[PDB]
Amino acid sequence: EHVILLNAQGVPTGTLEKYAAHTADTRLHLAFSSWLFNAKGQLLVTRRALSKKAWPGVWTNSVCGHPQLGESNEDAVIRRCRYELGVEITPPESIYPDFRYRATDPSGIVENEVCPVFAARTTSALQINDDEVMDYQWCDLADVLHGIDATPWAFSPWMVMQATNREARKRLSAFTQLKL
Amino acid sequence: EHVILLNAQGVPTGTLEKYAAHTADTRLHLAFSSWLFNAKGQLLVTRRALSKKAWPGVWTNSVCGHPQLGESNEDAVIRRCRYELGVEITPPESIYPDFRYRATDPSGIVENEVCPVFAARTTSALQINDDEVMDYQWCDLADVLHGIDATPWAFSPWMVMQATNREARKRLSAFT
Numbered sequence: 001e002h003v004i005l006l007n008a009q010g011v012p013t014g015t016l017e018k019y020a021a022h023t024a025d026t027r028l029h030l031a032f033s034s035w036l037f038n039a040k041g042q043l044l045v046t047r048r049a050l051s052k053k054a055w056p057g058v059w060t061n062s063v064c065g066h067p068q069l070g071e072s073n074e075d076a077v078i079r080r081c082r083y084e085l086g087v088e089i090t091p092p093e094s095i096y097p098d099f100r101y102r103a104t105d106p107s108g109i110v111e112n113e114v115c116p117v118f119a120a121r122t123t124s125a126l127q128i129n130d131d132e133v134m135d136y137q138w139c140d141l142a143d144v145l146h147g148i149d150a151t152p153w154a155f156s157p158w159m160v161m162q163a164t165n166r167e168a169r170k171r172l173s174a175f176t177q178l179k180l
Numbered sequence: 181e182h183v184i185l186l187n188a189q190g191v192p193t194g195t196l197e198k199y200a201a202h203t204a205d206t207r208l209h210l211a212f213s214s215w216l217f218n219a220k221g222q223l224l225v226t227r228r229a230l231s232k233k234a235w236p237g238v239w240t241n242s243v244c245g246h247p248q249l250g251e252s253n254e255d256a257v258i259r260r261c262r263y264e265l266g267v268e269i270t271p272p273e274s275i276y277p278d279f280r281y282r283a284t285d286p287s288g289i290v291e292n293e294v295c296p297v298f299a300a301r302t303t304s305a306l307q308i309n310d311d312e313v314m315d316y317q318w319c320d321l322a323d324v325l326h327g328i329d330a331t332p333w334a335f336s337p338w339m340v341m342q343a344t345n346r347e348a349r350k351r352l353s354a355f356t
């Protein structure tokens with residue numbers, strides 16, 4: 001598994017093995033983040049497993065990951081939803097295409113990413129992958145946003161950064177409608 | 181270190197080594213929980229180390245622990261305050277003396293405790309023991325309650341159950 005390296009502007013220059021790529025000195029690379037809603041409009045929040053190299057044991061949005069060579073961002077969303085959560089989804093919608101961020105985790109690991117954000121609906125039951133996700137909750141988006149506003153430090157920084165972007169937040173809101 | 185085994189009434193009936201005591205089948209034993217506030221009235225919230233056997237990596241109140249045989253609850257609080265956080269405190273005050281709870285963490289480790297709750301003020305700076313605490317935050321109690329009320333799953337279930345008890349929330353709200 002690898003990551004797609006990017007330079008100063010957002011242009012690909014090559015690839016790099018994924019573990020080896022996430023260190024105290026992580027270079028810029030391509031990622032995605034997704035927010036998943038069930039038919040009832042509840043948001044899936046997940047807790048990263050304790051074995052993740054970066055932000056292990058941390059509460060965050062539904063799924064994130066790293067597109068591979070030849071993969072579109074949307075296929076990467078679909079693949080990681082299957083891998084981490086075993087779940088089928090509707091075509092992922094682009095809700096924050098220019099999100100980019102750099103952050104250091106509690107033990108020193110850095111994520112440095114160009115990270116377009118998506119939202120989708122789940123169309124199957126979950127089969128959680130315990131190597132990736134250690135806990136989860138189906139919640140009202142309103143509640144999640146109130147908690148992020150009261151105690152943002154309790155959640156991953158990327159989750160918080162995406163949730164307070166005005167435009168992304170309106171799209172999350174639209175996914176809370178009940179759909180049969 | 182051990183934990184004190186309790187019968188159906190809270191009577192001590194024996195002890196177990198502390199690590200060996202917390203399993204998927206944890207038996208009832210004695211514990212404490214404490215909420216620490218600084219001189220400014222801010223609440224210390226901590227994140228348990230990833231090495232803790234129960235609820236590793238979970239955001240929770242300031243310091244919790246297990247009194248030893250013959251040790252007062254208050255002395256246990258003062259002991260663990262020193263051990264986990266390097267901090268001196270004022271005499272612990274009771275805020276929820278009959279709290280009792282049983283829960284199972286994401287990996288299946290259970291806590292099963294008679295767990296009186298206290299509150300105190302810090303009188304020195306923190307010196308963090310990273311074998312116990314991996315992160316922490318000084319915050320306004322109001323904000324922490326709002327967070328517990330909105331997303332309780334983001335915090336330890338014991339922190340939530342304490343903060344949601346009417347009286348306890350009452351008494352906590354006065355340390356600010």
Ligand SMILES: [Mg+2]
Pocket residue numbers: 063064065080084
């Ligand atoms: Mg992932």
Ligand SMILES: [Mg+2]
Pocket residue numbers: 243244245260264312
């Ligand atoms: Mg403790």
Ligand SMILES: [Mn+2]
Pocket residue numbers: 003022029031066111112113
């Ligand atoms: Mn990455």
Ligand SMILES: [Mn+2]
Pocket residue numbers: 183202209211246291292293
């Ligand atoms: Mn215990």
